[PDB]
Amino acid sequence: EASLTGAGATFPAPVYAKWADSYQKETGNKINYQGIGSSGGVKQIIANTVDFGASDAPLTDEKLATEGLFQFPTVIGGVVLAVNIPGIKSGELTLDGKTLGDIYLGTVKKWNDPAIVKLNPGVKLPDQNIAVVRRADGSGTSFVFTSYLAKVNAEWKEKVGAGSTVNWPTGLGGKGNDGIAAFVQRLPGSIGYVEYAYAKQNNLAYTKLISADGKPVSPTEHSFSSAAKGVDWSKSFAQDLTNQKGDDVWPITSTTFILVHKEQKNAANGTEVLKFFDWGYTHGAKQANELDYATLPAEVVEQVRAAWKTQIKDSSGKPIF
């Protein structure tokens, strides 16, 4: 029936693609998603070139208002550090916030650095340089990653800060989560940050991290979900889920957003866009979990739906949902 186009964040692309496939088989509706990074997604929706935009980085309530946009969270994922080190398998290496920051600051340049050795007793670390990989494009994953680094590394917060784009102290630039996954896979001694699904679907070895509570944790649907435990979304959908306290909390976790115009020039398309994501909330949980994405609390889902009812309307001012 419908034929929609959306563009933006690659962070949730794997699940959006799976949902789109399942949705089309069940309803006939076709949703095409272009993974061009969060920054590009925002520009495209504002330029009215797609039906919806996708960004992992929230837009300020101010800009949303000015641009006449509405944003809502869909799922919760996690950013992991994929590495390519001789003899190192997934989970065998552990890094903490401070040392991860120093690695991206370029002050820790070798895998057998004293700080890494200290974090990994009994692990055979090679005498080889670290090949740092970061994002070349405006990225929501970068926003999450750097927001986290700014919390755990004072030097990083002062010199680099956080953003969808920053002035990187060092490292190779890769395009999209796929680009970083490709470089890590091809470069010995490399490290690159990617949303969990990208490490898993490409069989990349990832590291464990030290939670805010100071305990070693592994990236899983549970450690991602745990970051949102006790979080209050009633006042703002733009919740920060980085370095959250609690048992088994993955430190680099985040939700992701969909952007649509408050006034839908094409009423039908707008209605079908919301129906797709409503399907994701209602019937996509199992497929999201299969791809290791945690789902939003049902409570918040109802909050999003209530918001759709009053914030999204057609050109004649009538509700589209």
Residues 6+ apart with CB under 8 A from 18: 287, 290, 291
Asked if 270 and 314 sit in the same domain, the reply is yes
- What is the Cα 6 distance to its own chain's centre? 17
Q: Give the whole-angstrom CA distance, residue 228 versus residue 217.
A: 16
Considering just the CA atoms, what is the radius of gyration of the chain in Å? 20
For 164, phi then psi, to 5°, come to -75, -15
CB atoms within 10 A of CB 158: 9
Q: Nearest 5 degrees, angle CA 248-CA 78-CA 127?
A: 85
Exposed (0-12), middle (13-18) or buried (19+): which is 262, by Cβ within 10 Å?
A: middle
Alpha-carbon span 92 to 314, nearest angstrom: 53
Cα distance between residue 136 and residue 157, in whole Å: 20
Q: Is 274 in the same domain as 129?
A: no
| 260 and 209 within one domain | no
CATH number assigned to the domain comprising residue 115: 3.40.190.10
* Distance of alpha carbon 156 from alpha carbon 99, whole angstroms: 11
56, 141 Cβ separation under 8 angstroms: yes
Work out how many domains the chain is built from and give that number: 2
Is residue 125 located within the same domain as residue 204? Answer: yes
**Do 10 and 48 sit in the same domain of this protein?**
yes
Residues 6+ apart with CB under 8 A from 62: none
Distance CA 213, CA 200 (A): 26
Same domain, 85 and 211: yes
The domain containing residue 57 runs over which residues?
1-77+230-239+254-321
3-class SS of residue 297: coil
CA 167 to CA 217: how far, in whole Å? 29
- Residues 209-242 as b/e (b if ≥16 CB within 10 A, e otherwise) read bbbbeeeebbbebebbbbbbeeeebeeebbbbbb
DSSP 3-state of 91: coil
Torsion over CA: 188, 171, 208, 219 (sign): negative
Amino acid identity, position 95: L
Q: How many helices (H) and strands (E) does the chain have?
A: 13, 15
Encoded tokens for 49: 């070139």
**Cβ partners under 8 Å of residue 182, min gap 6:** 174
Give the side-chain half-sphere CA count within 13 A for 174.
25
Method: X-ray
Residues 42 and 122 placed together within one structural domain of the fold: no
Could you tell me if 225 and 76 are in contact, meaning their C-beta atoms sit under 8 angstroms apart?
yes
Q: What distances in angstroms separate CA 84 from CA 7, 57, 107, 110, one per listed residue?
A: 30, 28, 19, 13
**Shared domain check, 234 and 289:** yes
**Which tokens belong to 29?**
């509706």
Place of tokens 């903490």: 96
Distance CA 252, CA 224 (A): 8
* Judgement on whether residues 89 and 2 belong to the same structural domain of the protein: no
SS3 category, 228? coil
Q: Which residues share a beta bridge with 173?
A: 134
The answer to whether residues 4 and 73 belong to one domain is yes
E strand spans, the chain = 3-8, 30-35, 52-55, 69-83, 94-95, 131-135, 172-174, 190-195, 205-206, 208-210, 216-217, 253-261, 263-264, 294-295, 313-314
Burial of 64 (0-12, 13-18, 19+ CB in 10 A): middle
Report how far residue 229's alpha carbon sits from residue 241's, in angstroms, rounded to the nearest whole number. 10
Q: What is the resolution in angstroms?
A: 2.0
